[PDB]
Design a binder for this molecule. Structure first.
Ligand code: ZN
Ligand code: ZN
Ligand code: ZN
Ligand code: ZN
Lengths: 79, 74
DNA sequence: CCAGAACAGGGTGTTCTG
DNA sequence: CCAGAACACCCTGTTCTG
């Protein structure tokens, strides 16, 4: 009830439909509004926690998608 | 030969005793002075090529070390 | 030609405003 | 509360100077 589902830092609200911190929120929005042609250097399961979230934007974006994050979630909730 | 021995980008000279590119050179200096204790997010065997050298400072640093980089190139 | 400094770009993170 | 914007910092990479 308190921590980000993407990196396990302290959540700051339900953003794009999921509990996340502010840094995961803006990271997702940026990935979604632009390009997200990232490449993993490991095996697409990089551990995304508070520090290492910087290491692999590929895995970080994957873990946002897998958690259900989507921009329209707030509008959709109102329906 | 003229590719960087850490990330395989085009090398720019012999830096800290190893053929490397500029970004790796300064990455390595920054790593040593910073004492950041990088931690890998995978299995300590990340691929470090040009397109991915930013992804893992722990592995990039380790790879600098294994390549023989050292701040006193006599 | 190379180390370190200075300057620059890219990527990430926090506070503000609707 | 939570959206996007504006402001801010961190991390990486290139050109300058000793
Ligand atoms: Zn997060
Ligand atoms: Zn990854
Ligand atoms: Zn390199
Ligand atoms: Zn690694």
């Amino acid at each position: 009830s308190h921590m980000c589902l993407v990196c396990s830092d302290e959540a700051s609200g339900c953003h794009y439909g999921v509990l996340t911190c502010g840094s995961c929120k803006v990271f997702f929005k940026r990935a979604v509004e632009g390009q997200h042609n990232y490449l993993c250097a490991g095996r697409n399961d990089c551990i995304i926690d508070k520090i290492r979230r910087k290491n692999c934007p590929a895995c970080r974006y994957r873990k946002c998608l897998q958690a259900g994050m989507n921009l329209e979630a707030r509008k959709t909730k109102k329906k």
